[PDB]
Amino acid sequence: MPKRIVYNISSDFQLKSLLGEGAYGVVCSATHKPTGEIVAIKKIEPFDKPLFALRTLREIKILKHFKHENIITIFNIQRPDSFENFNEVYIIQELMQTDLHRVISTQMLSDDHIQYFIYQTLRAVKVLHGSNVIHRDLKPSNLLINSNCDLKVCDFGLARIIDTRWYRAPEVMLTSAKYSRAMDVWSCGCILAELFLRRPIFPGRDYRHQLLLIFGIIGTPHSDNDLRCIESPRAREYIKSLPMYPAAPLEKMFPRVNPKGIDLLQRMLVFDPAKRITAKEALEHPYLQTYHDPNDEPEGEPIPPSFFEFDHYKEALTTKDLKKLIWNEIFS
Numbered sequence: 114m115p116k117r118i119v120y121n122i123s124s125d126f127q128l129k130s131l132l133g134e135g136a137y138g139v140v141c142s143a144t145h146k147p148t149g150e151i152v153a154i155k156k157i158e159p160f161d162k163p164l165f166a167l168r169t170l171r172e173i174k175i176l177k178h179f180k181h182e183n184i185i186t187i188f189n190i191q192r193p194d195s196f197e198n199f200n201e202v203y204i205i206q207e208l209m210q211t212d213l214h215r216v217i218s219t220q221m222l223s224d225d226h227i228q229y230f231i232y233q234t235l236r237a238v239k240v241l242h243g244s245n246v247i248h249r250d251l252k253p254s255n256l257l258i259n260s261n262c263d264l265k266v267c268d269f270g271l272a273r274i275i276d277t278r279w280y281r282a283p284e285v286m287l288t289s290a291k292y293s294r295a296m297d298v299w300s301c302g303c304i305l306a307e308l309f310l311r312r313p314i315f316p317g318r319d320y321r322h323q324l325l326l327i328f329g330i331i332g333t334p335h336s337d338n339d340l341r342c343i344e345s346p347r348a349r350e351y352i353k354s355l356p357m358y359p360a361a362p363l364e365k366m367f368p369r370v371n372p373k374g375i376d377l378l379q380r381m382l383v384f385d386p387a388k389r390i391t392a393k394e395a396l397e398h399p400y401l402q403t404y405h406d407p408n409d410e411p412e413g414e415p416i417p418p419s420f421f422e423f424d425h426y427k428e429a430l431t432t433k434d435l436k437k438l439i440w441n442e443i444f445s
């Protein structure tokens with residue numbers, strides 16, 4: 114518990130350990146004295162840029178609205194004592210043991226575990242997509258895991274309601290990419306790839322490098338038909354200035370990996386977003402039959418765009434505007 118970590122929270126809590134520290138959030142476990150229960154508290158200081166406040170608002174509205182076995186459970190949100198003093202947001206949630214990035218880099222995983230993790234990740238993506246929400250930042254560190262391997266997705270601040278570059282879909286990097294469910298499926302494929310390979314599959318240093326590593330594996334879109342899904346004719350030019358790589362032979366690349374797993378993986382890492390398998394289909398794929406239960410996979414209920422009506426504001430919301438919005442979401 115670095116001393117330089119201060120939480121203006123109810124004294125009922127005793128900070129125990131530091132679990133994460135970024136430019137947006139800081140997460141620590143903490144004991145709740147009245148019950149003895151250990152929890153996790155995500156502290157956010159969102160009022161220096163509108164971007165951080167928008168991210169904060171989207172994240173708590175999502176966490177307060179969604180209830181699903183594979184979505185992190187929120188217990189409550191600290192109640193600020195006054196509006197003037199309100200400068201930090203403290204989200205109190207169920208404590209999880211670790212996250213998938215930590216497991217992947219510290220554990221050898223059996224096939225059964227890889228199947229179960231990717232399965233739960235897809236089950237969460239399905240309910241979000243069914244509710245017309247795309248996460249947009251799916252990666253192993255945002256997949257929380259506890260001892261019995263239950264997985265729960267977290268970090269919902271970048272979500273959007275429809276209509277790290279290492280896990281980003283190519284379409285997102287070639288143009289003013291439209292938000293689509295397919296970009297989450299692409300990240301899911303990068304995560305499945307990482308589970309098999311035991312390290313990230315496309316660790317690009319920059320945008321150029323990233324595309325280089327990507328086509329290296331899936332094949333360079335050659336024919337016009339392939340590039341017709343790319344809006345910016347210049348973007349198409351860029352692609353053509355690339356080597357014409359052939360789709361790598363994954364069975365030979367991952368000789369110790371379950372073939373069905375390989376098959377599912379190639380249906381996810383497809384250049385053309387429209388040709389990418391959907392979350393729902395992926396749950397129905399043979400690789401996951403041990404876990405698939407079409408009567409236990411919530412389809413979701415549509416959320417209107419007005420749920421984040423502020424994402425469409427013409428004259429960009431002021432920080433004070435955003436502060437009242439966050440405050441009202443906390444007290445409701």
Ligand SMILES: Nc1ncnc2c1ncn2[C@@H]1O[C@H](COP(=O)(O)OP(=O)(O)O)[C@@H](O)[C@H]1O
Pocket residue numbers: 132133134135136137138139140153155185206207208209210211212254255257267268
């Ligand atoms: N509920 C939780 N239980 C245990 N660890 C957590 C929990 N929430 C977050 N963490 C840890 O904190 C890290 C960062 O949290 P995250 O919510 O993704 O915030 P950030 O926006 O900073 O990435 C995670 O990668 C994980 O290791």
Ligand SMILES: [Mg+2]
Pocket residue numbers: 254255268
């Ligand atoms: Mg995160």
